[PDB]
Amino acid sequence: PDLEATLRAIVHSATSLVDARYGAMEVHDRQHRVLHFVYEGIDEETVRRIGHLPKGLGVIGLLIEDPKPLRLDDVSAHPASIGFPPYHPPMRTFLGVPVRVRDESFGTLYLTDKTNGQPFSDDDEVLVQALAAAAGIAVANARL
């Protein structure tokens, strides 16, 4: 059972189901080390140009710190925003939710740039929570 592939399929589904241009999932350990980073909407050449993987700083760092849903009209405007690295696609609208089970949170599922230029909806948020939950069971199952 390839967990990386499983998490990637979840991200793929999330991006499609809520019409985001971009989607990503980070999964970390308790020491906040990056275990998995999977994504959709970004070409391999761009990925290469970005270079270093995200470390879970800024806005995602906020959700790792306090796991709960967060929608933003403009992720750059958030006080905690660290900004994009060189070569990274610019992104504006944002939806992120923990990837968890009841006992523990392991990750964050996040989507940007809904293709209609609108912020993500309440319904979008609830849907992504549901997909996140399926991911959470996968992660919990890989741990113990």
Residue numbers belonging to the annotated binding site: 88
Q: Determine, following the binding rule CB under 6 A, whether residue 53 of this chain makes contact with ligand HEM.
A: yes
Nearer to Ca ion, 2 or 123 (CB): 123
Q: Return all residues near 66 (Cβ < 8 A) that are at least 6 apart.
A: none
The DSSP bridge partners found for residue 85 are: none
Element (DSSP H or E) covering residue 108: strand 105-114
Residue type at 115? T
**Residues of the shown chain interacting with Ca ion in the complex, contacts defined by CB under 5 A:** 19
Q: How far apart are CA 22 and CA 10, in angstroms?
A: 13
Q: Determine, following the binding rule CB under 8 A, whether residue 97 of this chain makes contact with its own copies.
A: no
Nearer to ligand HEM, 45 or 103 (CB): 45
DSSP 3-state assignment of 18?
coil
Chain residues in the site for ligand CYN (CB under 6 A):
24, 54, 60
Chain residues in the site for ligand HEM (CB under 6 A):
22-24, 39, 41-42, 47, 50, 52-60, 75-76, 81-85, 88, 91, 94, 110, 112
